[PDB]
Write a protein that binds this ligand. Structure first.
Ligand code: HEM
Length: 153
Protein backbone atom coordinates (compact mmCIF):
# COMPACT_ATOMS: atom_id res chain seq x y z
CA UNK A 1 0.00 0.00 0.00
CA UNK A 2 0.40 3.53 -1.12
CA UNK A 3 -1.49 6.18 0.78
CA UNK A 4 -4.52 7.75 -1.05
CA UNK A 5 -2.20 10.68 -1.64
CA UNK A 6 0.27 8.44 -3.48
CA UNK A 7 -2.48 6.76 -5.59
CA UNK A 8 -3.51 10.22 -6.50
CA UNK A 9 -0.01 11.31 -7.74
CA UNK A 10 0.19 7.95 -9.67
CA UNK A 11 -3.19 8.57 -11.38
CA UNK A 12 -2.16 12.09 -12.08
CA UNK A 13 1.05 11.13 -14.09
CA UNK A 14 -0.89 8.28 -15.67
CA UNK A 15 -3.27 10.87 -17.12
CA UNK A 16 -0.26 12.06 -19.29
CA UNK A 17 0.21 8.56 -20.72
CA UNK A 18 -3.48 8.27 -21.45
CA UNK A 19 -3.26 11.32 -23.77
CA UNK A 20 -0.80 9.23 -25.96
CA UNK A 21 -0.77 5.58 -24.99
CA UNK A 22 0.84 4.29 -28.21
CA UNK A 23 3.59 6.85 -28.22
CA UNK A 24 4.56 6.22 -24.63
CA UNK A 25 4.22 2.37 -25.35
CA UNK A 26 6.65 2.38 -28.29
CA UNK A 27 9.24 4.41 -26.30
CA UNK A 28 8.93 2.08 -23.28
CA UNK A 29 9.58 -0.95 -25.51
CA UNK A 30 12.53 0.71 -27.34
CA UNK A 31 14.00 1.77 -23.92
CA UNK A 32 13.54 -1.79 -22.65
CA UNK A 33 15.18 -3.44 -25.68
CA UNK A 34 18.05 -0.94 -25.66
CA UNK A 35 18.79 -1.43 -21.90
CA UNK A 36 18.10 -5.29 -21.66
CA UNK A 37 18.47 -6.64 -25.21
CA UNK A 38 17.82 -10.04 -24.04
CA UNK A 39 14.14 -9.10 -23.46
CA UNK A 40 13.87 -8.73 -27.21
CA UNK A 41 13.90 -12.44 -27.66
CA UNK A 42 10.63 -13.11 -25.89
CA UNK A 43 9.10 -11.14 -28.70
CA UNK A 44 8.87 -13.15 -31.80
CA UNK A 45 7.10 -10.50 -33.90
CA UNK A 46 10.38 -8.63 -33.45
CA UNK A 47 13.38 -10.92 -33.05
CA UNK A 48 14.35 -9.61 -36.53
CA UNK A 49 14.46 -5.84 -35.67
CA UNK A 50 18.07 -4.76 -35.98
CA UNK A 51 18.21 -1.07 -35.10
CA UNK A 52 16.43 1.68 -33.28
CA UNK A 53 15.29 2.92 -36.69
CA UNK A 54 13.72 -0.47 -37.48
CA UNK A 55 11.96 -0.41 -33.98
CA UNK A 56 10.73 3.09 -34.62
CA UNK A 57 9.17 2.04 -37.93
CA UNK A 58 7.62 -1.19 -36.70
CA UNK A 59 3.86 -1.04 -36.63
CA UNK A 60 3.58 -4.24 -34.53
CA UNK A 61 5.99 -2.75 -31.93
CA UNK A 62 3.69 0.26 -31.60
CA UNK A 63 0.66 -1.97 -31.18
CA UNK A 64 2.20 -4.26 -28.65
CA UNK A 65 3.49 -1.25 -26.66
CA UNK A 66 -0.04 0.10 -26.77
CA UNK A 67 -1.54 -3.15 -25.56
CA UNK A 68 0.93 -3.39 -22.70
CA UNK A 69 0.35 0.22 -21.42
CA UNK A 70 -3.46 -0.10 -21.89
CA UNK A 71 -3.44 -3.19 -19.54
CA UNK A 72 -1.05 -1.46 -17.01
CA UNK A 73 -3.37 1.62 -16.85
CA UNK A 74 -6.34 -0.65 -16.11
CA UNK A 75 -4.50 -2.31 -13.18
CA UNK A 76 -3.30 1.00 -11.85
CA UNK A 77 -6.80 2.48 -11.72
CA UNK A 78 -7.78 -0.37 -9.43
CA UNK A 79 -5.32 1.09 -6.85
CA UNK A 80 -4.01 -2.10 -5.35
CA UNK A 81 -7.35 -4.00 -5.75
CA UNK A 82 -6.37 -5.58 -9.06
CA UNK A 83 -6.57 -9.26 -8.23
CA UNK A 84 -8.90 -10.03 -11.07
CA UNK A 85 -6.94 -8.05 -13.62
CA UNK A 86 -3.69 -9.57 -12.47
CA UNK A 87 -4.61 -13.22 -12.70
CA UNK A 88 -5.02 -13.54 -16.43
CA UNK A 89 -1.70 -11.65 -16.90
CA UNK A 90 0.26 -13.94 -14.59
CA UNK A 91 -1.40 -16.97 -16.25
CA UNK A 92 -0.28 -15.83 -19.77
CA UNK A 93 3.17 -14.46 -18.87
CA UNK A 94 4.09 -17.44 -16.72
CA UNK A 95 2.92 -20.22 -18.96
CA UNK A 96 2.89 -18.70 -22.40
CA UNK A 97 5.20 -15.74 -23.00
CA UNK A 98 7.26 -17.25 -20.27
CA UNK A 99 8.45 -14.00 -18.77
CA UNK A 100 10.78 -14.16 -15.80
CA UNK A 101 9.80 -11.77 -12.90
CA UNK A 102 13.11 -9.79 -13.37
CA UNK A 103 11.86 -8.77 -16.79
CA UNK A 104 8.90 -7.13 -14.99
CA UNK A 105 11.52 -5.15 -13.14
CA UNK A 106 13.28 -4.03 -16.35
CA UNK A 107 9.98 -2.89 -17.84
CA UNK A 108 9.17 -0.87 -14.62
CA UNK A 109 12.49 0.96 -14.92
CA UNK A 110 11.90 1.66 -18.65
CA UNK A 111 8.43 3.01 -17.76
CA UNK A 112 10.02 5.35 -15.20
CA UNK A 113 12.78 6.44 -17.64
CA UNK A 114 10.15 7.33 -20.26
CA UNK A 115 8.03 9.27 -17.72
CA UNK A 116 11.17 11.01 -16.53
CA UNK A 117 12.33 11.85 -20.16
CA UNK A 118 8.97 12.95 -21.48
CA UNK A 119 7.41 14.70 -18.45
CA UNK A 120 10.12 16.01 -16.07
CA UNK A 121 8.11 19.04 -14.97
CA UNK A 122 5.28 16.61 -13.92
CA UNK A 123 7.41 13.79 -12.59
CA UNK A 124 8.97 15.26 -9.49
CA UNK A 125 10.52 13.63 -6.37
CA UNK A 126 6.87 12.89 -5.20
CA UNK A 127 5.35 11.44 -8.39
CA UNK A 128 8.62 9.45 -8.78
CA UNK A 129 8.35 7.70 -5.37
CA UNK A 130 4.62 7.10 -5.75
CA UNK A 131 5.10 5.52 -9.26
CA UNK A 132 7.91 3.26 -8.15
CA UNK A 133 5.90 2.03 -5.23
CA UNK A 134 2.87 1.35 -7.49
CA UNK A 135 5.11 -0.59 -9.99
CA UNK A 136 6.73 -2.43 -7.12
CA UNK A 137 3.36 -3.46 -5.71
CA UNK A 138 2.51 -4.68 -9.22
CA UNK A 139 5.80 -6.76 -9.39
CA UNK A 140 5.25 -8.36 -5.98
CA UNK A 141 1.61 -9.41 -6.74
CA UNK A 142 2.77 -10.89 -10.03
CA UNK A 143 5.59 -12.80 -8.41
CA UNK A 144 3.23 -14.06 -5.78
CA UNK A 145 0.79 -15.20 -8.53
CA UNK A 146 3.76 -16.93 -10.26
CA UNK A 147 4.73 -18.75 -7.07
CA UNK A 148 1.16 -19.92 -6.59
CA UNK A 149 0.85 -21.08 -10.23
CA UNK A 150 3.87 -23.19 -9.15
CA UNK A 151 6.34 -21.14 -11.22
CA UNK A 152 9.65 -19.47 -10.70
CA UNK A 153 8.31 -17.20 -8.02
C1 HEM B 1 3.83 -3.69 -17.53
C2 HEM B 1 3.96 -5.03 -17.39
C3 HEM B 1 3.18 -5.82 -18.50
C4 HEM B 1 1.89 -5.76 -18.81
C5 HEM B 1 0.73 -4.96 -18.18
C6 HEM B 1 1.71 -6.62 -19.95
C7 HEM B 1 0.53 -6.86 -20.61
C8 HEM B 1 0.39 -7.63 -21.75
C9 HEM B 1 -0.89 -7.87 -22.39
C10 HEM B 1 -2.18 -7.27 -21.85
C11 HEM B 1 -0.67 -8.65 -23.46
C12 HEM B 1 -1.73 -9.25 -24.45
C13 HEM B 1 -2.48 -10.51 -23.89
C14 HEM B 1 -1.60 -11.55 -23.25
O1 HEM B 1 -0.82 -12.34 -23.89
O2 HEM B 1 -1.58 -11.64 -21.97
C15 HEM B 1 0.76 -8.93 -23.51
C16 HEM B 1 1.37 -9.70 -24.50
C17 HEM B 1 2.72 -10.02 -24.47
N1 HEM B 1 3.63 -9.60 -23.50
FE1 HEM B 1 3.21 -8.68 -21.70
N2 HEM B 1 2.92 -7.19 -20.31
C18 HEM B 1 3.85 -6.73 -19.41
C19 HEM B 1 5.19 -7.03 -19.40
C20 HEM B 1 5.80 -7.82 -20.34
C21 HEM B 1 7.26 -8.08 -20.39
C22 HEM B 1 8.32 -7.48 -19.43
C23 HEM B 1 7.47 -8.88 -21.46
C24 HEM B 1 8.76 -9.48 -22.10
C25 HEM B 1 9.98 -9.11 -21.74
C26 HEM B 1 6.16 -9.16 -22.07
C27 HEM B 1 6.04 -9.99 -23.18
C28 HEM B 1 4.84 -10.16 -23.85
C29 HEM B 1 4.67 -10.95 -25.05
C30 HEM B 1 5.81 -11.76 -25.71
C31 HEM B 1 3.41 -10.86 -25.40
C32 HEM B 1 2.75 -11.47 -26.66
C33 HEM B 1 2.86 -10.23 -27.59
C34 HEM B 1 2.44 -10.41 -28.99
O3 HEM B 1 1.28 -10.30 -29.38
O4 HEM B 1 3.31 -10.67 -29.88
N3 HEM B 1 5.16 -8.50 -21.36
N4 HEM B 1 1.38 -8.33 -22.42
Amino acid sequence: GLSDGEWQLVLNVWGKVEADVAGHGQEVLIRLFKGHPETLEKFDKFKHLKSEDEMKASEDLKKVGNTILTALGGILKKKGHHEAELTPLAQSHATKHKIPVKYLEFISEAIIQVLQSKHPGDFGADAQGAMSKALELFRNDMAAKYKELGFQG
